[PDB]
From a paper:
Our susceptibility tests and a co-crystal AcrB/3-formylrifamycin SV (3-FOR) structure show that other ansamycins (rifampicin derivatives) are also substrates for AcrB. The interaction of the drug with the short glycine-rich switch loop mediates the accommodation of 3-FOR inside the AP. In an attempt to prevent ansamycin binding, we made the switch loop more rigid by Gly619 and/or Gly621 to Pro substitutions. Surprisingly, the crystal structure of these variants showed propensity to bind either 3-FOR to both L protomer AP and the smaller AP in the T protomer in the same AcrB trimer or two rifabutin (RFB) molecules to the AP of the T protomer. We assume that the Gly619Pro and Gly621Pro substitutions induce a switch loop conformation mimicking a transition state during wild-type L to T conformer conversion while the HMW drug is bound to the AP. During the L to T transition, the HMW drug accommodates in the AP/DBP region, mediated by the flexible switch loop of the T protomer, in an induced fit manner. The intermediate positions of the ansamycins observed in these structures appears to precede the binding to the DBP as has been shown for erythromycin in the MtrD homolog RND pump from Neisseria gonorrhoeae.
The E. coli AcrAB-TolC drug efflux pump contains the inner membrane H+/drug antiporter AcrB comprising three functionally interdependent protomers, cycling consecutively through the loose (L), tight (T) and open (O) state during cooperative catalysis. AcrB is the homotrimeric IM proton-motive force-driven H+/drug antiporter component which recognizes and actively transports multiple drugs (antibiotics, detergents, dyes, and solvents) via the tightly connected AcrA and TolC channels across the OM, leading to an observable resistance phenotype. Four different entry channels (CH1–CH4) have been described with putative entrances from the periplasm or the outer leaflet of the IM toward the two drug-binding pockets, the access pocket (AP) and deep binding pocket (DBP) inside the AcrB pump. Here, we present 13 X-ray structures of AcrB in intermediate states of the transport cycle.
Author numbering:
A (entry chain D): 13 to 165
B (entry chain B): 1 to 986, 997 to 1033
C (entry chain A): 50 to 241
D (entry chain A): 290 to 337
E (entry chain C): 50 to 97
F (entry chain C): 722 to 769
G (entry chain C): 866 to 913
H (entry chain A): 674 to 721
Write the structure that this text describes.
Amino acid sequence: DLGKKLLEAARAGRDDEVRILMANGADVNAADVVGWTPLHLAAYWGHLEIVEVLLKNGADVNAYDTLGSTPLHLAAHFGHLEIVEVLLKNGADVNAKDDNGITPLHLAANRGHLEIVEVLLKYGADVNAQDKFGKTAFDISINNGNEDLAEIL
Amino acid sequence: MPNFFIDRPIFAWVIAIIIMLAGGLAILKLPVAQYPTIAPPAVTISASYPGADAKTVQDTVTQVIEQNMNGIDNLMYMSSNSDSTGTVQITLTFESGTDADIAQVQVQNKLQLAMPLLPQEVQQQGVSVEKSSSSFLMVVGVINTDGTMTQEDISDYVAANMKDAISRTSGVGDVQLFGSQYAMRIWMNPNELNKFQLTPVDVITAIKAQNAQVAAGQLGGTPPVKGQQLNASIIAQTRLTSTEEFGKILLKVNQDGSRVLLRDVAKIELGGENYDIIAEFNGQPASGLGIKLATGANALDTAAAIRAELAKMEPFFPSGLKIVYPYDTTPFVKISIHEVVKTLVEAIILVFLVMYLFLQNFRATLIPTIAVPVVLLGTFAVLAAFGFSINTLTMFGMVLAIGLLVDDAIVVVENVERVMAEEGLPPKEATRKSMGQIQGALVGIAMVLSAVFVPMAFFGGSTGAIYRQFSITIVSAMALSVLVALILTPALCATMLKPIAKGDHGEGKKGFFGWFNRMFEKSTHHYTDSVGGILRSTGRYLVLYLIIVVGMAYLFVRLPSSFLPDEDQGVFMTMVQLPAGATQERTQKVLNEVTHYYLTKEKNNVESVFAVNGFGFAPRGQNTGIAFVSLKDWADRPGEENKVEAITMRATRAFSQIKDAMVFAFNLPAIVELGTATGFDFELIDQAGLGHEKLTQARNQLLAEAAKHPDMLTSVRPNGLEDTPQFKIDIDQEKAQALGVSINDINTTLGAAWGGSYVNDFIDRGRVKKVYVMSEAKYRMLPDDIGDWYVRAADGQMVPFSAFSSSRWEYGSPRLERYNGLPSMEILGQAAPGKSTGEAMELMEQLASKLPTGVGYDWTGMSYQERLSGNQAPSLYAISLIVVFLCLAALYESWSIPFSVMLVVPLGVIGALLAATFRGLTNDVYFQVGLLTTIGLSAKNAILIVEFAKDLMDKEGKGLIEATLDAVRMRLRPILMTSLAFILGVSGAQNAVGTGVMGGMVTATVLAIFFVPVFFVVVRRRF
Amino acid sequence: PGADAKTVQDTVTQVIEQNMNGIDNLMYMSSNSDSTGTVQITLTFESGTDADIAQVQVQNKLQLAMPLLPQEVQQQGVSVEKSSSSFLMVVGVINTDGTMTQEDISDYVAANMKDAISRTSGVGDVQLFGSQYAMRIWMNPNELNKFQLTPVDVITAIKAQNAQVAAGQLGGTPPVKGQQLNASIIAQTRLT
Amino acid sequence: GIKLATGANALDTAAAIRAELAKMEPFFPSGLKIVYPYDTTPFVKISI
Amino acid sequence: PGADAKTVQDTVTQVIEQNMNGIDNLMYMSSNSDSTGTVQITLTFESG
Amino acid sequence: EDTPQFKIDIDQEKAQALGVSINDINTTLGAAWGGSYVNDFIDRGRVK
Amino acid sequence: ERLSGNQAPSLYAISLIVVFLCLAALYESWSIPFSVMLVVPLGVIGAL
Amino acid sequence: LGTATGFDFELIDQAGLGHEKLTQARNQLLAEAAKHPDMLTSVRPNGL
Ligand SMILES: CO[C@H]1/C=C/O[C@@]2(C)Oc3c(C)c(O)c4c(O)c(c(C=O)c(O)c4c3C2=O)NC(=O)/C(C)=C/C=C\[C@H](C)[C@H](O)[C@@H](C)[C@@H](O)[C@@H](C)[C@H](OC(C)=O)[C@@H]1C
Ligand SMILES: CO[C@H]1/C=C/O[C@@]2(C)Oc3c(C)c(O)c4c(O)c(c(C=O)c(O)c4c3C2=O)NC(=O)/C(C)=C\C=C\[C@H](C)[C@H](O)[C@@H](C)[C@@H](O)[C@@H](C)[C@H](OC(C)=O)[C@@H]1C
Ligand SMILES: CCCCCCCCCCCCCCCCCCCC(=O)O[C@H](COC(=O)CCCCCCCCCCCCCC)COP(=O)(O)OCCN
Ligand SMILES: CCCCCCCCCCCCCCCCCCCC(=O)O[C@H](COC(=O)CCCCCCCCCCCCCC)COP(=O)(O)OCCN
Ligand SMILES: CCCCCCCCCCCCO[C@@H]1O[C@H](CO)[C@@H](O[C@H]2O[C@H](CO)[C@@H](O)[C@H](O)[C@H]2O)[C@H](O)[C@H]1O
Ligand SMILES: CCCCCCCCCCCCO[C@@H]1O[C@H](CO)[C@@H](O[C@H]2O[C@H](CO)[C@@H](O)[C@H](O)[C@H]2O)[C@H](O)[C@H]1O
Ligand SMILES: CCCCCCCCCCCCO[C@@H]1O[C@H](CO)[C@@H](O[C@H]2O[C@H](CO)[C@@H](O)[C@H](O)[C@H]2O)[C@H](O)[C@H]1O
Ligand SMILES: CCCCCC
């Protein structure tokens, strides 16, 4: 009811509406057909305030979609440094693997978010973590030809 | 000229016959349609890409086509859609007056040169270039009642049997099949394919090989060996013609010598090309034909011919098949024509009654009864000459015109009857003098009425196209009325009318007519006594006039504005919108709930519900559906409660209960091709390669600002879809190359299985049709089924898809919009109650300027039309007034006197505004032309009052007040006679037409007879 | 692209010229085949000829020749235009700041300005004084031979890896009964 | 280098080009600027 | 090329002829499907 | 009048068993009896 | 040929009406036209 | 319409002589035109 309204508000970035919905008691575990909670969407679209507001209102930080991807995966992949930090502070699994064995470090390394990679390493990201193809964040950096990223890993 | 034909009544009769024959000939040869070509010429480039997403379609097809749409003449703008149904529709709208054939061939030609740049799959499917128009003559629905046929089974029959016959039918333009004919569906099994070490690539290779037309050659072909006895054509492979033949398509032979056929690894059946659209007519499987009217064709004859041909097909139809007509414009054109002929006859009947009531002789009552038909027939001839058609706009233009034709008839005859009654002249001499008095004014009235109606024909775009229909009709009818009034009706008066003795006002008569003459002679004396008192105290009445002009101006603005109103057309849609990721099974259940509702609760009003799943106005995703609700006759649905407006709100109100569905009913626009509903059509454009996501943010930012102005903007929404979750799959090139699996074989397996691959053509019962390889439903449903598909490596091992793939969820557009070859987002909205669209647009421009850098905007459709046409209005009002003034100046030989006539304008208008205000009507086109005809007839009255008044002062040397009182006296009877004919008498358009006059006349008649003499005296005294 | 005057003439110009027949009000025809790879066949018509129909007729014949032309020539896009030989005007574009180079300016005009001007009614032909950007793969024969690869392999890889794939949908039509999810399948997209 | 279509009006076409360029100028990058180094239409306007 | 009249008629002539609806001033339409492979669909229009 | 047609049937299985592709069969048959337009050549400076 | 013959009657009909009406207007009579138009058969038999 | 005195001549290969032969023919014609300054002035090829 209000869960399908929160999912739209979280995606759009309507801070005021999410706040009003949190007061009315909108379900923060309300997901779409792929299993994306409002935190997933807020993390994907880079809505920092909503991410903070949702976590305050008892949202699952380690919630996973039907392919095992958590909000930190999305935040790390789409270069939302502030959200990545907020999620990790609220106890986000930094070494979380999706169904492909891919981690937030792999995704951040791929798109080349050097700042985010450093934040993930700070909170204890397994640099030697391999995907289903046996490839690390280092193996990505050399393939992409990222000199700065290659040095860090 | 009157003098000429008074002495030559046979000539006058010959001209009348030539006009009647020309008119009678025109009526038969004239086209017939509901509405003419109003919308500007639009050419839509349609294409299909099986299994392609919005972006794949856009970035391979749409952009390539859009880049190659140069060197095309008279193009105003270009809009394109690219959605996840694998569809692209590029609409190119052209300048009004462009040759639609030349426009299309230029678009067609530039596309054909861009075809080698499109994908092979799109080239194979083909790109359609058609004249963009949803103005169907009728929709012929084909249904199966006994449930023996599916939607596929019906569509195939309609295509193979009916479609070509409806195409052949006399007066039929374009025929669209509501569905696809059969296709050879190969439903592959990945468990079977993997078992025999095969892929969809092998299935496609085998179908391409074993289902083909092979050129062999000839026996004894030239150059031959001299002495050859026979020359025969050689036949090798031809196309397959059965599911059996396709079954035996040999894929592989094993070591033991066993045959692996196509039937072993795939299910094979005659299915449909498309499964995205599910159409139902009251819950029963249905197809249909979208018939259009051909250029210069008769809608009534075409519709009859279509039904006549469908009747000859009745015997050949399969068991359970029925023909239905959910949409038909034919009944409207019948009424439009019928209600003109009704008014035409009622007018003639009422004139006769009033003519006899006052003049009291049958010989006089026949002069209008001849004149009016002659002019009306003449109008039909002039419409044919200028290339116009019999339609609503031209027909209701004639209804309004009849008022002017009736006046010209009464005016000429009454003036002869008076001149005879007052002087005692013989009819022939009386007509000479009578015409001598009015002949100058009649010519003047023609130029004034020309100066009123002609200018609105020079409006630009859609608005001008509509006004042109009324303008030419009324000007033609009016122009011929004056010609007939100067040629025929004088000659009739001089020959048919009987001598009246000098001073015989029929007061010496007995009975009703004896009483009436004494009664009316009193009323005429009391009238002149009243006007006598009015002209003593003019200043007071000039204050009462300014109260009316203030009242008019105020009551004009407060009345709601429109072009063509939303009327009960016996049809209305019901949009069914499920959330992102919803399937067609979920959508169908809501469509069933919508269908059930209308057939249960609205059984009295609703005839049928055409429930189309996976459709809007174009093909949409599984999560969308529309229901075309067809109502019963208006005779079966009495009361305002059982009209679309109330039925719509009741339906929308009841469907607020439905969970996980935005279900709402809405009425059809009068002309859909424009979609004009008051408001605007705003385009938000990416001008700096910002991307889709950045354009979405800017749109949300604009929608937010618009929502903070309810006082100015109302219902400001996007005409687009929000980003939906989509299944991203990444093929590892390293793991593919390492295992010896080619990416072509990988992308083909995925594309063919999950998306469907159009392989080649086969021949089903003498008709060429498409062959489609695709995965059987249950193996291409969920992401877990990805790994069930195997691709053969170079070494011969079968590698599963999970081995060299890695999938994740992301968000992407299910429908990407572009405007003028730039990424856009269409935004609809309207002005708030008591606000103009011009104001609302000016705010949208203001709000749009505060959006991020690189985000531009533009106006399209009705906005573009209203933007340009609105700027012309002041220039046309100026010419209209300036020329009206100049015409009267030449008539009265005075710069001052014309004002006395022109001051009548508000007296005609005020009545219609009061009538419209209290009945709660809108300022629609029908009403606006209604005001022009009310003003015209009001001016006509005043023109003859002033002419008579000025003539008495000039010729007979009478005083200002004497001449005025003597003039208004002479002109009282003919003004009341015309006015009485309306009072006796003489369906939303019918209201706008009738009420655009009735209220006007009831007041205008009373106001004019008292105020015209004031204007003349006041103006004459001033100058 | 990369053809000499004769290759161009013998594989395109002649093939097109031979199909130009039964065209109304044609005075004469002149063609130029040059070593840039460019063909230009001008068909001059009688004074009073409808340029719209002249274009329609000329292209009707070209479309018969189109399939006989090389795939490289078709994929470059053949253009039929009914314009003056001289220039109406020249719309110059400079960068006063000097932030953008001659190549950067040409690309912008091509990508952001040219198309809209080419669609404008009255504009018979637009000619970019420059070139729109392309993904230039500048091959090294020393490095190609080293790893035992050819321009053939380079072209095979690009078409295969820089692909835009139509991969279908999850819960697509016709679906199984009880399907709850419907989502577009996104495989390979064009490299950016 | 814009070339006039056969029969098309030079002044009318030139006016439409300037109108379309006027819609582009606002969204130019920093530094980019239009210049008119060759136009045959001004002579027609002035000489008339 | 190398297609009998029937194959030619079903795959070409029928497909073209069925799309020859909505053409102004069409008196009649005659077509030949030959064993050479050739099709010739002639559309004769109203005089004028 | 109806003409005689020499219908030659290619056994798809028998060909696959012997290891001959039907592309080579269809081309050999097609090119031999019917003729095959391969490409153009220049005869005294003209495309033929 | 069929068209030529099928429209010939209505051609003669309107041709007579027009000539009749033209005489009626010119000579301001209904008798002169009728007295004249009766001559037509005397000519037509000659041509036949 | 061209220039006042100017003419536009086209030398044609009628018998399929080739480019080299047509060049010789052109070079010869240009030389003969150069020997008549009294009649012809600036006779040159419009090519490369
Ligand atoms: C004014 O016009 C109306 C009817 C014309 O009558 C018809 C017969 O003619 C149509 C024309 C010429 C269109 O252009 C349409 C259109 O673009 C549609 C839809 C819808 O399906 C339509 O339904 C039409 C449509 C008609 O039925 N939008 C789409 O498909 C898309 C991509 C819609 C996206 C979002 C929503 C769902 C949509 O924006 C909604 C919020 C409203 O704006 C419309 C439903 C309007 O209804 C109203 C006034 O509430 C119609 C345009
Ligand atoms: C009489 O004509 C003149 C103006 C036409 O007015 C214009 C607007 O219309 C033109 C047309 C319809 C052409 O066909 C041209 C042409 O073919 C040219 C050149 C050359 O740029 C042109 O310039 C035009 C040209 C025009 O400017 N030749 C070439 O490009 C090639 C491939 C080679 C050039 C060879 C030499 C160098 C050239 O022949 C030269 C010797 C002169 O003969 C010309 C430059 C003429 O200059 C004058 C004033 O003597 C013009 C043709
Ligand atoms: C497609 C558009 C259609 C265009 C149609 C154009 C047709 C052209 C017609 C040309 C008319 C000729 C010029 C007028 C004639 C005047 C001189 C006639 C000789 C003469 O002595 O004058 C009298 C005329 O009457 C007078 O004193 C004046 C009256 C003149 C009568 C004019 C007759 C024209 C009839 C045309 C019919 C078509 C109508 C379509 C609008 C003769 O006659 P009379 O007095 O001796 O009489 C018989 C009494 N016993
Ligand atoms: C292709 C197929 C199409 C088929 C469609 C139908 C075609 C319609 C064709 C129209 C034919 C015209 C018919 C004319 C009617 C003539 C009436 C006879 C009059 C008559 O003989 O009396 C005259 C006196 O008339 C008088 O008393 C004076 C005249 C006043 C009365 C005139 C009334 C005419 C009414 C016409 C209505 C026709 C409607 C048709 C739609 C005598 O002669 P005279 O004494 O004058 O001559 C000598 C002067 N010294
Ligand atoms: C001063 C000069 C008047 C002298 C003549 C006056 C009377 C004429 C007598 C004629 C004999 C019949 O008398 C006539 O009957 C008709 C009936 O149609 C009536 O005429 C009228 O009378 C009634 C009222 O009584 C009206 O409502 C009605 O409109 C009408 O019927 C009159 O009563 C009379 O005008
Ligand atoms: C609400 C809708 C708009 C209302 C429009 C009203 C206009 C139509 C009604 C006009 C009726 C005319 O009524 C007429 O009025 C004038 C005064 O104004 C009267 O005249 C009166 O004033 C004059 C001037 O001082 C005196 O000389 C005269 O003796 C006296 O009777 C007439 O005797 C009367 O017949
Ligand atoms: C470009 C459009 C310009 C026209 C616009 C003006 C339209 C108004 C037309 C005015 C109506 C005619 O005006 C009226 O005509 C009649 C004849 O019919 C004139 O009367 C005239 O009759 C005849 C015929 O012309 C003359 O020989 C005679 O000298 C004169 O008395 C009147 O003196 C005049 O007042
Ligand atoms: C005065 C003669 C008028 C004739 C018009 C037909």
